[PDB]
Design a protein around this ligand. Structure first.
Ligand SMILES: *[C@@H]1O[C@H](CO)[C@@H](O[C@@H]2O[C@H](CO)[C@@H](O[C@@H]3O[C@H](CO[C@H]4O[C@H](CO)[C@@H](O)[C@H](O)[C@@H]4O)[C@@H](O)[C@H](O[C@H]4O[C@H](CO)[C@@H](O)[C@H](O)[C@@H]4O)[C@@H]3O)[C@H](O)[C@H]2NC(C)=O)[C@H](O)[C@H]1NC(C)=O
Ligand SMILES: *[C@@H]1O[C@H](CO)[C@@H](O[C@@H]2O[C@H](CO)[C@@H](O[C@@H]3O[C@H](CO[C@H]4O[C@H](CO)[C@@H](O)[C@H](O)[C@@H]4O)[C@@H](O)[C@H](O[C@H]4O[C@H](CO)[C@@H](O)[C@H](O)[C@@H]4O)[C@@H]3O)[C@H](O)[C@H]2NC(C)=O)[C@H](O)[C@H]1NC(C)=O
Ligand SMILES: *[C@@H]1O[C@H](CO)[C@@H](O[C@@H]2O[C@H](CO)[C@@H](O[C@@H]3O[C@H](CO[C@H]4O[C@H](CO)[C@@H](O)[C@H](O)[C@@H]4O)[C@@H](O)[C@H](O[C@H]4O[C@H](CO)[C@@H](O)[C@H](O)[C@@H]4O)[C@@H]3O)[C@H](O)[C@H]2NC(C)=O)[C@H](O)[C@H]1NC(C)=O
Ligand SMILES: *[C@@H]1O[C@H](CO)[C@@H](O[C@@H]2O[C@H](CO)[C@@H](O[C@@H]3O[C@H](CO)[C@@H](O)[C@H](O)[C@@H]3O)[C@H](O)[C@H]2NC(C)=O)[C@H](O)[C@H]1NC(C)=O
Ligand SMILES: *[C@@H]1O[C@H](CO)[C@@H](O[C@@H]2O[C@H](CO)[C@@H](O[C@@H]3O[C@H](CO)[C@@H](O)[C@H](O)[C@@H]3O)[C@H](O)[C@H]2NC(C)=O)[C@H](O)[C@H]1NC(C)=O
Ligand SMILES: *[C@@H]1O[C@H](CO)[C@@H](O[C@@H]2O[C@H](CO)[C@@H](O[C@@H]3O[C@H](CO)[C@@H](O)[C@H](O)[C@@H]3O)[C@H](O)[C@H]2NC(C)=O)[C@H](O)[C@H]1NC(C)=O
Ligand SMILES: *[C@@H]1O[C@H](CO[C@H]2O[C@@H](C)[C@@H](O)[C@@H](O)[C@@H]2O)[C@@H](O[C@@H]2O[C@H](CO)[C@@H](O)[C@H](O)[C@H]2NC(C)=O)[C@H](O)[C@H]1NC(C)=O
Ligand SMILES: *[C@@H]1O[C@H](CO[C@H]2O[C@@H](C)[C@@H](O)[C@@H](O)[C@@H]2O)[C@@H](O[C@@H]2O[C@H](CO)[C@@H](O)[C@H](O)[C@H]2NC(C)=O)[C@H](O)[C@H]1NC(C)=O
Ligand SMILES: *[C@@H]1O[C@H](CO)[C@@H](O[C@@H]2O[C@H](CO)[C@@H](O)[C@H](O)[C@H]2NC(C)=O)[C@H](O)[C@H]1NC(C)=O
Ligand SMILES: *[C@@H]1O[C@H](CO)[C@@H](O[C@@H]2O[C@H](CO)[C@@H](O)[C@H](O)[C@H]2NC(C)=O)[C@H](O)[C@H]1NC(C)=O
Ligand SMILES: *[C@@H]1O[C@H](CO)[C@@H](O[C@@H]2O[C@H](CO)[C@@H](O)[C@H](O)[C@H]2NC(C)=O)[C@H](O)[C@H]1NC(C)=O
Ligand SMILES: CC(=O)N[C@H]1[C@H]([C@H](O)[C@H](O)CO)O[C@@](O)(C(=O)O)C[C@@H]1O
Ligand SMILES: CC(=O)N[C@H]1[C@H]([C@H](O)[C@H](O)CO)O[C@@](O)(C(=O)O)C[C@@H]1O
Ligand SMILES: CC(=O)N[C@H]1[C@H]([C@H](O)[C@H](O)CO)O[C@@](O)(C(=O)O)C[C@@H]1O
Ligand SMILES: *[C@@H]1O[C@H](CO)[C@@H](O)[C@H](O)[C@H]1NC(C)=O
Ligand SMILES: *[C@@H]1O[C@H](CO)[C@@H](O)[C@H](O)[C@H]1NC(C)=O
Ligand SMILES: *[C@@H]1O[C@H](CO)[C@@H](O)[C@H](O)[C@H]1NC(C)=O
Lengths: 173, 317, 317, 173, 317, 173
């Protein structure tokens, strides 16, 4: 939410993207395609696995403790035993509630961040050869076949190759 | 003509609702449960050494109620006390029962070493019909019911030093007779008394003549006490009557042992975390099965479910 | 020529200072207080059932000090004990007073059922000038002061079984006489003793002959004890003298009842959260009024104020 | 703070904007105006109400507890009763302090985010017809009357209508 | 031709690894330790008033064991008890030793005021060879061992009112004689007894005739008790024998005083936070030196190190 | 991490920048230089000092407490004393662990934010006179001597002075 991409300027997610979390759809002379971006996907996944590594399989051993159920009425000492345990449980219950709320807010934001970072990186790559349509899509002002699109996804696109073509298309009348 | 290149992210047809700081219900692509809420219902016999008390409380196994004879000298990580347990020897109480139960539980052993106390002036090995051992009147295996010798009973004064490396635990007691029908029969006089001391400690107990409500048809009682004797120290027993004497000492150990009230069956399986409901897996950080646990356990919380988001916000198409 | 379009945000002339992770003082447009720091000063009589002890402690109401006769059989969610309270019956103590007070408070009722104990061999209904009931020497309503019959007193041996579905609470005691002036007057002998037992329990008490510092001009004392009798169990009273006997039992209940020391007046109002200072609203999550609370209350913290930002940073013009 | 808009590239807030938290000021041929943006305003407000829903009116019922004041000196058991309560109160006091500090940092950042998102959305909408002056304002390189400004605020601005005019103004000499 | 302008950030050749929410090992340019893990090993004598018990426990200093005479009336913020301490007066125990030790520790003073009790019917100032004071048989300075006067001993009945503004603490005791060799020698009869009462309280104690294990060659014992007397109240001592009487009262104070078991030497230095290992600095919020602390101390945690990042991520060149 | 500058589009840090945390490197007609940016540096440092002010030298005084080591076996009351202390220590240990993890995540993000803010501010300042090369560097399309570069770093660069020169260089063929 906090970056504004997921559930923001990207209208919705793609159920048809099953091999990654983030990626690219394109339309060009040769058709309409989709490819996952593995680096952004793995960036998000690694961060979430970091949270899981802190929370899963990390338990504390406890052995002899205090009694926590009682069959006789006893007064003062039993009141204290009960109060200590009820106190403990409320503090842990609070820790667990807050932990999940904060981590979840953060997971939603970090995943939004990874979408935004990929968008930004792609924007800069395109230089003067494309414009941002406001919905996560770039209008590319030159012929850009499957190999050209591939070159953008792979970070090998040379913007100078297309710049004259693109400027001509962009600033026509 | 040109091209269009759209950046996007996945979505799933079956998202999961989680809580966040700003929204109690937001759908994400995936989540995982942090609260363990189920048990298989059996206490796994591994990897902790389980001792199923069966019909015996720890205290009954300690004192040596005949039906608990099979418990002699056993050890445990976790002693399991069953709600069906019952006493079937001489009726008794233990002032501060809970503490004795606890310190033995924690010690984690019933290792008992017999000692030769110089008992002269009295008849040893008193028995009763309310404590049947092998179809014959008997008594608590670890206690020695001391009565007269030829209608006579002088003031006992037996000593026992602790030369060991560990705390000795002595269990002893006092008989409270029903009337004069068991005041002049086993002790041979109007009055009796028990003083159990050390270099550091003294406990003195007065017998009480009086009928109690019959428990398994006996109206007299025994009151059970204990005394820890540290290395270099010495136990002393001054008695003028009514002594329920120790036959020796239990070893006190320190370690990770405990006791748990549970009726769950013991199963042939391996689980680090035990609750009274049965063992539970310990992958999750929290659990709402039971506040009583033993072993490497998730922490008890009040919530039934806490979902940790493991994916992005789910924004369907 | 064209146009200019500026994006911006509001600001207010009266911002509020809050704390953050990086700055202890940052101004925001608005904030709300999370710590409740005020009470109206009255304990609201709703929605919890309040029982104002007035001149009576719970214990005095329990024993049945004449001025507390109006408390018989009443129930409460919260019993309120006043600092002006005082005892005005026979002087007494309760070993572990705090526990008896607690278990009755928690039980939340003074429901008392009279029982017919077979008292033969003694005169019942002993009274004193230090416990005036309706302008006439009297005693604790729930206790039966047992004295001789014709300069004679045999060994009492009365039984009472618990056939009910609930724990019975028996309050009983022992008289400690001033000298021989009330050793040979109410019991007719040199010596007395009290044993109150069950299937599970035994309490035995020795009377003590001796003058105490006069309290409301009486130098003898009564020591008060209690015994809980579970369903299927039986109370037994062996006494050879000095018994302050129960006239019956109190019902033990479980629920949400408690007791609170407070001098705040009771008001005709509705508030879920009670402190000794008075009721407090419970909208806020925290409070610094009192660590002692009853009901749905904010949690006690040490801070006087904690401001939660409810708007953006305030950046004036 | 973390996005850089509020108390950053936006020099200050507007005391005169009383019908929203975020919005637009403009100067054009027909004068100088102000309109609140309800969507960004409501986005911020909803998030803050989410925090409030978690913290306000959510109390825990407690009944019989332990005693917490004492008129007699007693030693061991009273030491423990006092220590349990003092322990509890310090843990809750810590929870309350940290909660407010973290939530406040987050509220300040999320409100900054909402300002930034609206700015960004407006920038993309303008395409090649405006430039960012660095202080939250766009220089729009075409005649843009009240209806035109309205169209930008309402998300109905058609950038193609003005593009030739704007390019001519932008890339003149 | 033009120009190039690059934005960037610093890096360092020696970064530090910290933990984060998403990564257990990430390198930052700098960090600071939040857990104090070292002590210099001395307890600084400032700014808290330290009282080094040396050979004396607090209890021995309280009772007035001869070697502790130098402790009379001293105060402390922190009393330091040494593991080499030993008793060298009459052998004794204190039922609930831990509570007496605690309430005196917390009171923070040994201020003692002598009072003139009317002791007639007995010989005062009993002494023993096991409590040598200035090369002469003696006794606990604050106790008065009361024995017969001419093979006779009437029932003592001494009163003492508390007209002060503070709680008085009375320490008193009972002698338990070895045999009849010290039953008919110091009291002149077969039997004795002690009742120490107030308006609010009564404690009664029975002496016990019996040999104990010899401690520094004495086999009799003294059992030590205490009684707090509030303003407006009165102490009463009924005794028929065996009384170990108070010579007066200790002042009870309230404040920040305590006691600590430690063998660390006292140094001439200034440190707010004391542990048994020595004083520690209190700049850091946490510490893993000891769970036992006194003063303004970091909070004890289990971790040995917690590094707070104080710079950006370190991304070397 | 969350903004994408430090350890993202900025390939690495500068060990040679010893007088600030953030800054500028340039190449022009007169050579290659480096200058620290004090405002962004101080922004980051002040926030980290704010965290330190909350955590350093803030201890709580405690005096008489409960005993925490025991030389005798006692049972119920000692079990409770031990359990209260072990409970306390685990709760504090949790607080300390979580505090450091969260603060560290936040410090890393806020420092990334300060880098991003300076980058963004510089981008807007340059208007139509430069393009973003995607690696934190701007290609400036005009002669920009040491004083010109100085003017950008000091926020006094007048983009109109160079605009004709830059447009000519940018949109040539
Ligand atoms: C929604 O989100 C969760 C969490 O991110 C995903 O679930 C995880 O998926 C991975 C991969 O399938 C699981 O990894 C496997 O763990 C097994 C251990 O089983 C228990 O123990 C864990 C804790 O360690 C518990 O959390 C869990 O409940 C289990 O009871 C291993 O046995 C597996 O090993 C097998 O595969 C590997 C290959 O990677 C081989 O090397 C092995 O030999 C073996 O064949 C494996 O490591 C992980 O346990 C899951 N976590 C949780 C918390 O459930 C979901 O997949 C995800 N959903 C979607 C649609 O993406
Ligand atoms: C600064 O920030 C705070 C918090 O965001 C704002 O205060 C809130 O304002 C709203 C709207 O005025 C309040 O909503 C009202 O709550 C009343 C309940 O009163 C008590 O209970 C709440 C908890 O529920 C306590 O927090 C509070 O202190 C009160 O003691 C209702 O009775 C109101 O209902 C009335 O209006 C509605 C119309 O919306 C009708 O449906 C009803 O019939 C009735 O007439 C209302 O719901 C809210 O209580 C305030 N919260 C707090 C915490 O104080 C400030 O307004 C804001 N300042 C500025 C300048 O924006
Ligand atoms: C890595 O990160 C840390 C934390 O940001 C930096 O360390 C801090 O550096 C400053 C400046 O050097 C230190 O400030 C000095 O504090 C001294 C107090 O000493 C003790 O007390 C503090 C708590 O107050 C403890 O944390 C610390 O361990 C010490 O034991 C003062 O005595 C100093 O005063 C002197 O200088 C000032 C001028 O500023 C004069 O006014 C004085 O008269 C006097 O001469 C000074 O204020 C601070 O203590 C450090 N903090 C910590 C936690 O260690 C590292 O510098 C940083 N590393 C790099 C490479 O940047
Ligand atoms: C003090 O009072 C109690 C209660 O009245 C007396 O104990 C009771 O004594 C009778 C007869 O001696 C017991 O009877 C026996 O019990 C079994 C079990 O039901 C019964 O089947 C047999 O007939 C057998 O004789 C009875 O159980 C017992 N009751 C209780 C409640 O304990 C006691 O004897 C009195 N004390 C003295 C000194 O007389
Ligand atoms: C043991 O010692 C105490 C204290 O000396 C004796 O008690 C005191 O006895 C006197 C006279 O019997 C009491 O006097 C009475 O008190 C009221 C109240 O002030 C007074 O106005 C009357 O004159 C009345 O006679 C006195 O109160 C009482 N003092 C205390 C402090 O309790 C006690 O008698 C002695 N024991 C024996 C067996 O003699
Ligand atoms: C009850 O039994 C105990 C233990 O047998 C008796 O105490 C022991 O008595 C002897 C001789 O009276 C003590 O001897 C003395 O001890 C020192 C220290 O070693 C020794 O060097 C001397 O020779 C000296 O006479 C012995 O210490 C003592 N033992 C213990 C363990 O306390 C006690 O006398 C018996 N009670 C009665 C009433 O006879
Ligand atoms: C609760 O008790 C108060 C005061 O109690 C004192 O009353 C004295 C007469 C005497 O018994 C003393 O030992 C005790 O401490 C009661 O108020 C008193 O009521 C009486 C009789 O109605 C009046 O004669 C007094 O004027 C009056 N005294 C004071 C100081 O107010 C009060 O009635 C009682 N409350 C209830 C509800 O029973
Ligand atoms: C604290 O006590 C120590 C040692 O205590 C022993 O002293 C023996 C002589 C004997 O009493 C034994 O029961 C006890 O355990 C004192 O040190 C001793 O001081 C004496 C007299 O000055 C010397 O004769 C010894 O050499 C010396 N012994 C040792 C082992 O050091 C010490 O003086 C005392 N401290 C204080 C402050 O009183
Ligand atoms: C495990 O057993 C516990 C304890 O028996 C169960 O909790 C109790 O449930 C019963 C019946 O629902 C209630 O009457 C008690 O009040 C509960 N006690 C407590 C302390 O909560 C629990 O339901 C069981 N859990 C599982 C997963 O089997
Ligand atoms: C509510 O009453 C409590 C308890 O009486 C008050 O706290 C005490 O205040 C007095 C006088 O200021 C101090 O002497 C005590 O030390 C305080 N006790 C404790 C435990 O803090 C409190 O001030 C009152 N609060 C309100 C809002 O009325
Ligand atoms: C300070 O002393 C404590 C207590 O003696 C030390 O902790 C003990 O260390 C010993 C020996 O390593 C162990 O046998 C104990 O189990 C430890 N006890 C506890 C409660 O942890 C501690 O190591 C010392 N710390 C420093 C910094 O000197
Ligand atoms: C050691 C001894 O004396 N045992 C006898 C006991 C005791 O006298 C009473 O149990 C004490 O009250 O009584 C019996 O009737 C019994 O219980 O079998 C006979 C038995 O020989
Ligand atoms: C039941 C009984 O015997 N009551 C009498 C008591 C007791 O003897 C003493 O209170 C016990 O010490 O004494 C009185 O003087 C009294 O207090 O009014 C007369 C009263 O009839
Ligand atoms: C007050 C008194 O009577 N003191 C005497 C004691 C006691 O009789 C016993 O210590 C009690 O058991 O015994 C001595 O042998 C001793 O210890 O020096 C002689 C001493 O005069
Ligand atoms: C981009 O990378 C992929 C890796 O699978 C490769 O198959 C593809 O040919 C590359 N595209 C281009 C245009 O080089
Ligand atoms: C924009 O929306 C508002 C809604 O109040 C409407 O009144 C206005 O006419 C719209 N502006 C334009 C230019 O359509
Ligand atoms: C920029 O500011 C610095 C401040 O040290 C100054 O020395 C320098 O001359 C300024 N640069 C220009 C081009 O004005």
């Amino acid at each position: 939410g906090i970056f504004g991409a997921i559930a923001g300027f990207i209208e919705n997610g793609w159920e048809g993207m099953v091999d990654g979390w983030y990626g690219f759809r394109h339309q060009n002379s040769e058709g309409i395609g989709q490819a996952a971006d593995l680096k952004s996907t793995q960036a998000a996944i690694d961060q979430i696995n970091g949270k899981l590594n802190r929370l899963i399989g990390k338990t504390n051993e406890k052995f002899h403790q205090i009694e926590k159920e009682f069959s006789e009425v006893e007064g003062r000492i039993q009141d204290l035993e009960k109060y200590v345990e009820d106190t403990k449980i409320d503090l842990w219950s609070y820790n667990a509630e807050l932990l999940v709320a904060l981590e979840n807010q953060h997971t939603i934001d970090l995943t939004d961040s990874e979408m935004n970072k990929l968008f930004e990186k792609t924007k800069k790559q395109l230089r003067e050869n494309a414009e941002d349509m406001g919905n996560g899509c770039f209008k590319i002002y030159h012929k850009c076949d499957n190999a050209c699109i591939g070159s953008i996804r792979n970070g090998t696109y040379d913007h100078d190759v297309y710049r004259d073509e693109a400027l001509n298309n962009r600033f026509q009348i | 003509p040109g091209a269009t290149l759209c950046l996007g992210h996945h979505a799933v047809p079956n998202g999961t609702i989680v809580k966040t700081i700003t929204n109690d219900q937001i759908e994400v692509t995936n989540a995982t449960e942090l609260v363990q809420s189920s048990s298989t219902g059996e206490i796994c016999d591994s990897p902790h050494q389980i001792l199923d008390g069966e019909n015996c409380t720890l205290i009954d196994a300690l004192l040596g109620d005949p039906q608990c004879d099979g418990f002699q000298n056993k050890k445990w990580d976790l002693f399991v006390e069953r709600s069906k347990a019952y006493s079937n020897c001489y009726p008794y109480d233990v002032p501060d029962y809970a503490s004795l139960r606890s310190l033995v539980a924690s010690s984690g052993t019933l290792e008992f070493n017999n000692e030769s106390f110089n008992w002269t002036g009295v008849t040893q090995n008193g028995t009763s019909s309310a404590c049947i051992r092998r179809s014959n009147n008997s008594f608590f295996s670890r206690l020695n019911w001391l009565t007269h010798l030829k209608f006579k009973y002088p003031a006992l004064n037996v000593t026992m030093p602790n030369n060991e490396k560990f705390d000795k635990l002595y269990i002893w007691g006092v008989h409270h007779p029903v009337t004069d029908n068991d005041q002049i029969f086993p002790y041979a006089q109007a009055s009796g008394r028990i003083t159990v001391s050390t270099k550091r400690s003294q406990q003195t107990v007065i017998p009480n003549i009086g009928s109690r409500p019959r428990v398994r048809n006996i109206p007299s009682r025994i009151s059970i006490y204990w005394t820890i004797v540290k290395p270099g120290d010495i136990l002393l027993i001054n008695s003028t009557g009514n002594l329920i004497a120790p036959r020796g000492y239990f070893k006190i150990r320190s370690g990770k042992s405990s006791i748990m009230r549970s009726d769950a069956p013991i199963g042939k399986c391996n689980s680090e975390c035990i609750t009274p409901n049965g063992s539970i897996p310990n992958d999750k950080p929290f659990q709402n099965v039971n506040r009583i646990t033993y072993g490497a356990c998730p922490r008890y919380v009040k919530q039934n479910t806490l979902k940790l988001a493991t994916g992005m916000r789910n924004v369907p198409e």
